[PDB]
């Protein structure tokens, strides 16, 4: 709701294509097969 009107200096928009079910596994702090070799979110990931 407040993401419309919250000031952030930069937004890292990372675009790619993966398998369907693995999207929910991309969460701040979540670990898995992709969180160790391809792309891991930071432990303070504030985004979408």
């Amino acid at each position: 709701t407040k993401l419309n009107d919250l000031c952030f200096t930069n937004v890292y928009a990372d675009s790619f294509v993966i398998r369907g079910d693995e999207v929910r596994q991309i969460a701040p702090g979540q670990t898995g097969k992709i969180a160790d070799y391809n792309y891991k979110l930071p432990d303070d990931f504030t985004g979408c």
Partner: antibody, heavy 118, light 107 residues
Framework: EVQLLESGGGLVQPGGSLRLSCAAS????????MSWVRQAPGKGLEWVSV???????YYADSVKGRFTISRHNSKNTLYLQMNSLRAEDTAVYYC????????????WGQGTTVTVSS | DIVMTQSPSSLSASVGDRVTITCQAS??????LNWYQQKPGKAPKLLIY???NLETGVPSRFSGSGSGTDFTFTISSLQPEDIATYYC?????????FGQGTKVEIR
């Protein structure tokens, strides 16, 4: 050279804590995925728990808190403690390393039999 | 969540007979299917990967086919070395529910 051995287990009394040791050489424990699997005598496979790279431990719901995991880099070995083992957990245990999506878990380790019978 | 059960549960044949195994999943799986040989007592051994390429040691009589949810496995000539249980599972979504397992024993 690459070699995977295991230690731990016996005929201790029920409610007696134990510590399995998985000594692997030739690979990197820190940056590899690994799992623990127990197998009943004369039965099929039965997965237990997973450890990822970077300190992330997970299990099944029935074994939610079973393990206390630690590693030693002097010989690149794993130590894994269970407090007050359970009776029907009498089985042969294996520490395994899976290559996942480039050929999955071809060769197995040794596996040690642990009996916690009364 | 996802439970993956083998279409065949208990198949018994003799030496040299064809063996047909269907490996289905709850929904479509891809590149996460392996054909193993555990065998009684001895350590499990993976034999066939990706269902298309033969590995060193596996006889050419074994074949695999399929692109998608269902993968099929064919043994033209059953041999005494094939007394085993085939397990194909979904090692993607924890927890790993167990399948039925195709136990092939020769007569």
């Amino acid at each position: 050279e690459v070699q995977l051995l295991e230690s731990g287990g016996g005929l201790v009394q029920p409610g007696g804590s134990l510590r399995l040791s998985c000594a692997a050489s030739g690979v990197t424990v820190t940056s590899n995925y690994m799992s623990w699997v127990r197998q009943a005598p004369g039965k099929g496979l039965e997965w237990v728990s997973v450890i990822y790279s970077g300190g992330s431990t997970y299990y099944a719901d029935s074994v939610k808190g079973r393990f206390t995991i630690s590693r030693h880099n002097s010989k690149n070995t794993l130590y894994l403690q269970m407090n007050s083992l359970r009776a029907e957990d009498t089985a042969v245990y294996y520490c395994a390393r899976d290559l996942r999506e480039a050929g999955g878990m071809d060769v197995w380790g040794q596996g040690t039999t642990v009996t916690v019978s009364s | 969540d996802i439970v993956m059960t083998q279409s065949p549960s208990s198949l018994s044949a003799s030496v040299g007979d064809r063996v047909t195994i269907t490996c289905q999943a709850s929904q479509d799986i891809n590149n996460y299917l392996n054909w193993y040989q555990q065998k009684p007592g001895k350590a499990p051994k993976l034999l066939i990967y990706d269902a298309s390429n033969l590995e060193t040691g596996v006889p050419s009589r074994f074949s695999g086919s399929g692109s998608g949810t269902d993968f099929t496995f064919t043994i033209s000539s059953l041999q005494p070395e094939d007394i085993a249980t085939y397990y194909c599972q979904q090692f993607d979504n924890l927890p790993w529910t167990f399948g039925q397992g195709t136990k092939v024993e020769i007569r």
